[PDB]
C-alpha cells in the first residue's frame, strides 16, 4: 500500500522529470517568426431552425454535406447544409441525448444520453424509414460522446469514467477503457482511427490504443474538468477545453502540452473544441454565448463567432474545411464561412 | 424557380417534417416536466408507484399529461446534466422524515446539502421544489424515541410530531436563497396516499400559470 | 418486404370509368411519394401522374390532364387512380412506383407488379434511344446509348437519369438513379456515364439475369418522360 503509493509517486517525478527535459524549447517562442493569420471574418451562411430545445450535439459528415444534430425535446435531424432542408428527423427513445454521431460512410447514425443506451439509427433502411439498428447497452453512466470507427464498431464515453469500444453487429463491448477517475466528456478519434484521447473530468485526456485496448499516454495541466476534445489534422497532437476559461494544445510524440489558449476578458466554460482543415486555427465554444477562433501556432485570438444567444454546446468542421457547423443552446445552428 | 424538381421535393419534405417537429413541440410543451430527486431511498420508489440511468414515467392526471423523471442510480457527477433539466417544469424532492435519526454525518444532513445544493444552483435559480416529507407515520412513531436533537441540536421544542414536523419543514424552506421567485411546496405523506398526486397537481398548476404570465409578457 | 400490388385492371368500354388501386406493404407508405407510370403494350414511354406525400403537390401528363385523378390514403397505405372517359390510348399495363425525394435518395427504386386495363374499340423534353435491338453475347460488354433534347445537369451539379431495365414478364427496376448511383441490389456490372445531353450505360459482363428493355427517363422536369427501351436480345 504505502510501498506502491512511493512508488507510483517516484513514476509521476520521473515522468514530470522526462518531460522537463525534452522540453527545450516552447511552441510560442519557436512560431514567432511567422505571420499572424490576421482578423478572421466568419459570416453566418446558414441559420438552421427546427429544434424546439437545446442542441447538446452535433456531428458532419464526410461529404461535408449532411449535418446530424440532437436536441433535448428528443429529436435526431440530418439537415442537408448546402439547401437547410431536413433530410431526416428521428424521433428518440430517450429525450436526454447529450451526444450524436455519423458513420463516415453515411449509412447510420448515433445517439446517447441520461438513459446510458447508445442507439445506432439506419439511414438506408429498404423501407425507407429511419429505424434504431442497434441498442448498446452496458454502459453505467451518461453517453458523453460517441465516435464512429466504420461501420461494424464504434467508440463512445461514458459518465462512468470509462470509454468503451463496441462492437454494433453483436452488441457487445469489444473492448473497455479504464482508468479515468473522472467522467469522461468528450471523445476524438485520430484520423487513422487506431489511436483516440478521452477527455474526462479528473482534470486529465488519456490517449487510448483501439487494438491493445491499453492506455497509450495520459495528458494533465487542465485545471478542470475537460468538457470538449479534438485531434490535430496531422494526428499527432490534440487539443483540449476545459471548465477555466482555456483551451490546451498538447503533443502525442512530446508527451507535453504544446500551447495553452486563454484570455483574461474570458472566465466561461469551454464545450466544444474543433480543427480547421490545416489545423492552423482553433475553434472553440465557450459559456458566453460566443465562440473564440484562436491562431493555434500563435495562441492568438483570431476572431470571434457570436450569432448565438445562448451558451454554445457543440461545434464542428466540415471534412474538407469548408464551413463550421455551430449548434447552441438557444435551439439553433449556424454555419459560417 | 432556380430548384428541380427532386429539389422542389425535398423541400416539401423538409416542409412536412417542419410541420411534423412543429406539431410534436406543441404537444410536448403542455406536457408538465418533472425531475425526481432524492438523497436515495427516501421514497421516490413509494412516490412514482402512486403517481437505466434515467427513469421517465408518463401519467395523466385531471387533463395534464406528468412526464417525470427519476435520476436515481446514475451515481456520476451530477453538475455535469442538471443543465439538461433546465426547463423542468416542477421538482419533486422527497426526503425521509425518519432517516432524521439514522446516519449513512447524518442521512438528513446529507438530503438537505443536496437540496440546498439543486435548489440554490444556478439552472434552478426560478425553478419551483415541491417537496415531499415521506415516512410521516415512522417519524411519528420513531419521534418519541429518539429526540430530534440527535440531527437538530438547536431544537428547543418538545418530542411531538406536529412540532417536529413543523420544525423540519422550516428548516428545509430555510435553504431557499431566492423565497422572492421560488415557491418551496412542502406536503406530508407516509404510504399510498392519493392526496400526493393532488398537491402535484395544485403546485403544477401554480407554476404553469405563473409560466403563461411570463411568456406572455405580463409577469 | 416491400411490395406493391396492383388491383382494378380489365376490359373497360370507351369512355367509362375505372379506380386502379395499389396496396402498399413492407414500407412507411406516408413518407413516400408515389407515380402512376404507364406501359403500352408496344412503347412503355408514358408517365401518368405523381402525388407526393402528403399529397402536397399533385402533377398529370398531359394526355391524362382533367382526366385521371391520382390520390393517396396513408391508413390504409393504398394509392388510387381514379380515370373517367377512358380512350382507345389508354389500353396499357399500369404500375405504382415508390419514389421518396431527399438528398442521396433513390427515387423510382421499386415498382408494382402492374395491372393491365384495355379499352375496347410539345414544350416536354424527349429521350431518345440510340438503337432498339441489341444482339449480345453473356460475358460481354454492352453499351446502350440515350440523348436528350435539353441538358439534364442542374446547376446544383446533378444530371437527372434514370436508367431502369424490364425483364421480360416482370416490372421495371431502378439500375441507375442521378446518371452515376448503383441502386440497392443492383451488381456492379452496371456503370452510367454522361455530359448533360449524351449518356452511356455500361454493361460488364453480361449474364441472363439482366436480359431485357433498358429505359432512360429524365426527372429535371416535371413532366417525366422515358426512352424508347432498348431491347437486349440472346
Known amino acids: 500500500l504505502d510501498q506502491l503509493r512511493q512508488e507510483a509517486e517516484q513514476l509521476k517525478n520521473q515522468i514530470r522529470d522526462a518531460r522537463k527535459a525534452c522540453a527545450d524549447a516552447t511552441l510560442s517562442q519557436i512560431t514567432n517568426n511567422i505571420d499572424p493569420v490576421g482578423r478572421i471574418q466568419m459570416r453566418t451562411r446558414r441559420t438552421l431552425r427546427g429544434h424546439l430545445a437545446k442542441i447538446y450535439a452535433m456531428h458532419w459528415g464526410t461529404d461535408s454535406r449532411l449535418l446530424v444534430s440532437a436536441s433535448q425535446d428528443g429529436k435526431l435531424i440530418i439537415w442537408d447544409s448546402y439547401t437547410t432542408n431536413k433530410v431526416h428527423a428521428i424521433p428518440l427513445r430517450s429525450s436526454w441525448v447529450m451526444t450524436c454521431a455519423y458513420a463516415p460512410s453515411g449509412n447510420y447514425v448515433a445517439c446517447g444520453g441520461l438513459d446510458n443506451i447508445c442507439s445506432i439509427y439506419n439511414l438506408k433502411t429498404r423501407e425507407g424509414n429511419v429505424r434504431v439498428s442497434r441498442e448498446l447497452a452496458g454502459h453505467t453512466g451518461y453517453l458523453s460522446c460517441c465516435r464512429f470507427l466504420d461501420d461494424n464498431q464504434i467508440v463512445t464515453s461514458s459518465g462512468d469514467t470509462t470509454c468503451a469500444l463496441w462492437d454494433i453487429e453483436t452488441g457487445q463491448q469489444t473492448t473497455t477503457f479504464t482508468g479515468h477517475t473522472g467522467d469522461v466528456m468528450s471523445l476524438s478519434l485520430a484520423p487513422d482511427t487506431r489511436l483516440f484521447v478521452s477527455g474526462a473530468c479528473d482534470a486529465s485526456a488519456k490517449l487510448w490504443d483501439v487494438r491493445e485496448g491499453m492506455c497509450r499516454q495520459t495528458f494533465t495541466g487542465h485545471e478542470s474538468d475537460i468538457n470538449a476534445i479534438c485531434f490535430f489534422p496531422n494526428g499527432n497532437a490534440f487539443a483540449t477545453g476545459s471548465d477555466d476559461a482555456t483551451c490546451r494544445l498538447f503533443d502525442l510524440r512530446a508527451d507535453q502540452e504544446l500551447m495553452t489558449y486563454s484570455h483574461d476578458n474570458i472566465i466561461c466554460g469551454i464545450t466544444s473544441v474543433s480543427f480547421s482543415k490545416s489545423g492552423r486555427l482553433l475553434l472553440a465554444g465557450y459559456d458566453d454565448f460566443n465562440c473564440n477562433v484562436w491562431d493555434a501556432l500563435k495562441a492568438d485570438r483570431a476572431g470571434v463567432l457570436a450569432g448565438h444567444d445562448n451558451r454554445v454546446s457543440c461545434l464542428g468542421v466540415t471534412d474538407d474545411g469548408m464551413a463550421v457547423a455551430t449548434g447552441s443552446w438557444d435551439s439553433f445552428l449556424k454555419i459560417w464561412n | 424557380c432556380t430548384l428541380s424538381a427532386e429539389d422542389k421535393a425535398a423541400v416539401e419534405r423538409s416542409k412536412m417534417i417542419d410541420r411534423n417537429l412543429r406539431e410534436d413541440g406543441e404537444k410536448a410543451a403542455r406536457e408538465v416536466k418533472l425531475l425526481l430527486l432524492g438523497a436515495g431511498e427516501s421514497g421516490k420508489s413509494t412516490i412514482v408507484k402512486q403517481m437505466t440511468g434515467i427513469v421517465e414515467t408518463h401519467f395523466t392526471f385531471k387533463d395534464l399529461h406528468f412526464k417525470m423523471f427519476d435520476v436515481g442510480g446514475q451515481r456520476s457527477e451530477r453538475k455535469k446534466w442538471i443543465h439538461c433539466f433546465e426547463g423542468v417544469t416542477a421538482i419533486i424532492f422527497c426526503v425521509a422524515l425518519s432517516d432524521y435519526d439514522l446516519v449513512l454525518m447524518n442521512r438528513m444532513h446529507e438530503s438537505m446539502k443536496l437540496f440546498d445544493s439543486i435548489c440554490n444552483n444556478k439552472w434552478f435559480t426560478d425553478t419551483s421544489i415541491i417537496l415531499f416529507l415521506n415516512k410521516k407515520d415512522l417519524f411519528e412513531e420513531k419521534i418519541k424515541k429518539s429526540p430530534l436533537t440527535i440531527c437538530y441540536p438547536e431544537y428547543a421544542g418538545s418530542n411531538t410530531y406536529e412540532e417536529a414536523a413543523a420544525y423540519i419543514q422550516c428548516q428545509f424552506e430555510d435553504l431557499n436563497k431566492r423565497k422572492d421567485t421560488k415557491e418551496i411546496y412542502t406536503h406530508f405523506t407516509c404510504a399510498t396516499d392519493t392526496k400526493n398526486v393532488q398537491f402535484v397537481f395544485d403546485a403544477v398548476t401554480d407554476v404553469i400559470i405563473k409560466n403563461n404570465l411570463k411568456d406572455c409578457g405580463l409577469f | 418486404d416491400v411490395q406493391l400490388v396492383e388491383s382494378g385492371g380489365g376490359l373497360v368500354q370507351p369512355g367509362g370509368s375505372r379506380k386502379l388501386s395499389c396496396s402498399a406493404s413492407?414500407?412507411?407508405?406516408?413518407?413516400?411519394?408515389m407515380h402512376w407510370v404507364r406501359q403500352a403494350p408496344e412503347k412503355g414511354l408514358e408517365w401518368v401522374a405523381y402525388?407526393?406525400?402528403?399529397?402536397?403537390?399533385?402533377y398529370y401528363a398531359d394526355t391524362v390532364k382533367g382526366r385521371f385523378t391520382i390520390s393517396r390514403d396513408d391508413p390504409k397505405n393504398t394509392l388510387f387512380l381514379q380515370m373517367t372517359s377512358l380512350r382507345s390510348e389508354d389500353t396499357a399495363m399500369y404500375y405504382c412506383?415508390?419514389?421518396?425525394?431527399?438528398?442521396?435518395?433513390?427515387?423510382?427504386?421499386?415498382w408494382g407488379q402492374g395491372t393491365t386495363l384495355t379499352v375496347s374499340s410539345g414544350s416536354d423534353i424527349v429521350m431518345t434511344q440510340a438503337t432498339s435491338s441489341v444482339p449480345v453475347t453473356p460475358g460481354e460488354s454492352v453499351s446502350i446509348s440515350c440523348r436528350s433534347s435539353?441538358?439534364?445537369?442542374?446547376?446544383?451539379?446533378?444530371?437527372?437519369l434514370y436508367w431502369f431495365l424490364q425483364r421480360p414478364g416482370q416490372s421495371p427496376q431502378l439500375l441507375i438513379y442521378?446518371?452515376?448511383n448503383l441502386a440497392s441490389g443492383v451488381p456492379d456490372r452496371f456503370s452510367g456515364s454522361g455530359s448533360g445531353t449524351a449518356f452511356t450505360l455500361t454493361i460488364s459482363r453480361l449474364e441472363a439475369e439482366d436480359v431485357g428493355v433498358y429505359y432512360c427517363?429524365?426527372?429535371?422536369?416535371?413532366?417525366?418522360?422515358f426512352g424508347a427501351g432498348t431491347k437486349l436480345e440472346l
Open positions: 412506383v415508390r419514389s421518396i425525394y431527399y438528398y442521396g435518395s433513390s427515387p423510382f427504386d421499386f
Open positions: 413492407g414500407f412507411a407508405f406516408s413518407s413516400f411519394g
Open positions: 402525388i407526393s406525400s402528403g399529397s402536397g403537390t399533385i
Open positions: 435539353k441538358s439534364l445537369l442542374h446547376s446544383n451539379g446533378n444530371t437527372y
Open positions: 442521378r446518371m452515376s
Open positions: 427517363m429524365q426527372h429535371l422536369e416535371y413532366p417525366l418522360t
